[PDB]
Scaffold this active site. Structure first.
Site, PDB file in Angstrom:
ATOM      1  N   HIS A  37       0.767  -1.226   0.000  1.00  0.00           N
ATOM      2  CA  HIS A  37       0.000   0.000   0.000  1.00  0.00           C
ATOM      3  C   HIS A  37       0.810   1.295   0.000  1.00  0.00           C
ATOM      4  O   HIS A  37       0.176   2.316  -0.185  1.00  0.00           O
ATOM      5  CB  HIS A  37      -0.950   0.034   1.206  1.00  0.00           C
ATOM      6  CG  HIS A  37      -1.896  -1.125   1.165  1.00  0.00           C
ATOM      7  ND1 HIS A  37      -2.852  -1.256   0.191  1.00  0.00           N
ATOM      8  CD2 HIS A  37      -2.043  -2.177   1.949  1.00  0.00           C
ATOM      9  CE1 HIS A  37      -3.516  -2.356   0.398  1.00  0.00           C
ATOM     10  NE2 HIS A  37      -3.052  -2.979   1.465  1.00  0.00           N
ATOM     11  N   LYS A  41      -4.547  -9.932  -7.580  1.00  0.00           N
ATOM     12  CA  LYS A  41      -5.234  -9.268  -6.483  1.00  0.00           C
ATOM     13  C   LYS A  41      -6.339  -8.395  -7.067  1.00  0.00           C
ATOM     14  O   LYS A  41      -6.059  -7.536  -7.900  1.00  0.00           O
ATOM     15  CB  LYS A  41      -4.243  -8.450  -5.655  1.00  0.00           C
ATOM     16  CG  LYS A  41      -4.767  -7.757  -4.437  1.00  0.00           C
ATOM     17  CD  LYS A  41      -3.722  -7.133  -3.541  1.00  0.00           C
ATOM     18  CE  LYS A  41      -4.213  -6.827  -2.135  1.00  0.00           C
ATOM     19  NZ  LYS A  41      -4.946  -5.532  -2.029  1.00  0.00           N
ATOM     20  N   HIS A  44      -3.249  -3.088   7.820  1.00  0.00           N
ATOM     21  CA  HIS A  44      -4.262  -3.408   6.859  1.00  0.00           C
ATOM     22  C   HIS A  44      -4.812  -2.092   6.302  1.00  0.00           C
ATOM     23  O   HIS A  44      -5.004  -1.165   7.080  1.00  0.00           O
ATOM     24  CB  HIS A  44      -5.336  -4.248   7.524  1.00  0.00           C
ATOM     25  CG  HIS A  44      -6.624  -4.334   6.828  1.00  0.00           C
ATOM     26  ND1 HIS A  44      -6.872  -5.106   5.735  1.00  0.00           N
ATOM     27  CD2 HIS A  44      -7.771  -3.641   7.094  1.00  0.00           C
ATOM     28  CE1 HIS A  44      -8.124  -4.932   5.353  1.00  0.00           C
ATOM     29  NE2 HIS A  44      -8.673  -4.049   6.180  1.00  0.00           N
ATOM     30  N   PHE A  45      -5.063  -2.040   5.008  1.00  0.00           N
ATOM     31  CA  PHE A  45      -5.718  -0.909   4.389  1.00  0.00           C
ATOM     32  C   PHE A  45      -7.199  -1.236   4.263  1.00  0.00           C
ATOM     33  O   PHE A  45      -7.559  -2.153   3.518  1.00  0.00           O
ATOM     34  CB  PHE A  45      -5.106  -0.622   3.010  1.00  0.00           C
ATOM     35  CG  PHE A  45      -5.572   0.695   2.456  1.00  0.00           C
ATOM     36  CD1 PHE A  45      -6.747   0.794   1.734  1.00  0.00           C
ATOM     37  CD2 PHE A  45      -4.835   1.851   2.689  1.00  0.00           C
ATOM     38  CE1 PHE A  45      -7.228   1.979   1.276  1.00  0.00           C
ATOM     39  CE2 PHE A  45      -5.325   3.036   2.230  1.00  0.00           C
ATOM     40  CZ  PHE A  45      -6.490   3.120   1.546  1.00  0.00           C
ATOM     41  N   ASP A  46      -8.025  -0.504   4.956  1.00  0.00           N
ATOM     42  CA  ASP A  46      -9.438  -0.822   5.008  1.00  0.00           C
ATOM     43  C   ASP A  46     -10.229  -0.134   3.924  1.00  0.00           C
ATOM     44  O   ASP A  46     -11.049  -0.783   3.286  1.00  0.00           O
ATOM     45  CB  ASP A  46     -10.002  -0.517   6.386  1.00  0.00           C
ATOM     46  CG  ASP A  46     -11.238  -1.382   6.633  1.00  0.00           C
ATOM     47  OD1 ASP A  46     -11.134  -2.620   6.415  1.00  0.00           O
ATOM     48  OD2 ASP A  46     -12.299  -0.893   6.973  1.00  0.00           O
TER      49      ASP A  46
END
Length: 124
Positions: free
Chosen positions: A12, A41, A119-121
Site C-alpha cells: 500500500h 489481487k 491493513h488498508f481498510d
C-alpha cells in the site's frame, strides 16, 4: 515470515511518487510489489505519502473497520492515493488494472508496539 506491518508497506505505500503518472501505473506496481504473482489481487490502493504520515494515522480518528474490528483509524487529512482495480480483460497471469487517481481520507487497521498500520481498510 513477512510481518503484517511490512506487508502493508509493500502492498500500500508508494512514497516515491506523488500520484499515478500514467494509466499503466497500477499494472506496473501491482506486478513489482508481487501482488499478481500467485493470482490477480482484485483491488488495491497505493498511498503517495511519507511512511511516517501514514503510520501517524494510527493516532488519529478511531473508527470500526468494515469487518467490525475496533483497531481502525481514519486520517484527519486527505491523502494522494491511487485506486487499482482489475479490468474486465484481466486474466492471470496477465493481470490488468484500471488506475484511478484520487485525494481521499484513508482508513487503516493498526497493531503492535510501535502501533502501526497492518491493513488498508478503505479510502473515503
Amino acid at each position: 515470515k513477512e510481518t503484517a506491518a511490512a506487508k502493508f508497506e509493500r502492498q500500500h505505500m508508494d512514497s516515491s511518487t506523488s500520484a499515478a503518472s500514467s494509466s499503466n501505473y497500477c499494472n506496473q506496481m501491482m506486478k513489482s510489489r508481487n501482488l499478481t504473482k500467485d493470482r490477480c489481487k482484485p483491488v488495491n490502493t497505493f498511498v503517495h505519502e511519507s511512511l511516517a504520515d501514514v503510520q501517524a494515522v494510527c493516532s488519529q480518528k478511531n473508527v470500526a473497520c468494515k469487518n467490525g474490528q475496533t483497531n481502525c483509524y481514519q486520517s484527519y487529512s486527505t491523502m494522494s492515493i491511487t485506486d487499482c482495480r482489475e479490468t474486465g480483460s484481466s486474466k492471470y497471469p496477465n493481470c490488468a488494472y484500471k488506475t484511478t487517481q484520487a485525494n481521499k481520507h484513508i482508513i487503516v487497521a493498526c497493531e503492535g508496539n510501535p502501533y502501526v498500520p497492518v491493513h488498508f481498510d478503505a479510502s473515503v
